[PDB]
Design a protein around this ligand. Structure first.
Ligand SMILES: [Cl-]
Ligand SMILES: [Cl-]
Ligand SMILES: [Cl-]
Ligand SMILES: [Cs+]
Ligand SMILES: [Cs+]
Ligand SMILES: [Cs+]
Ligand SMILES: [Cs+]
Lengths: 16, 16
């Protein structure tokens, strides 16, 4: 739920 | 870690 795949913005986990 | 901002692939939480 929200839109896309899994959780947040991105590929992975954290920022970069 | 990974590449991006978060956890996963994209925007929010889940599949869509
Ligand atoms: Cl969704
Ligand atoms: Cl995601
Ligand atoms: Cl990341
Ligand atoms: Cs999603
Ligand atoms: Cs992410
Ligand atoms: Cs996470
Ligand atoms: Cs789900």
């Amino acid at each position: 739920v929200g839109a896309x795949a899994x959780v947040x913005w991105x590929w992975x986990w954290x920022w970069x």
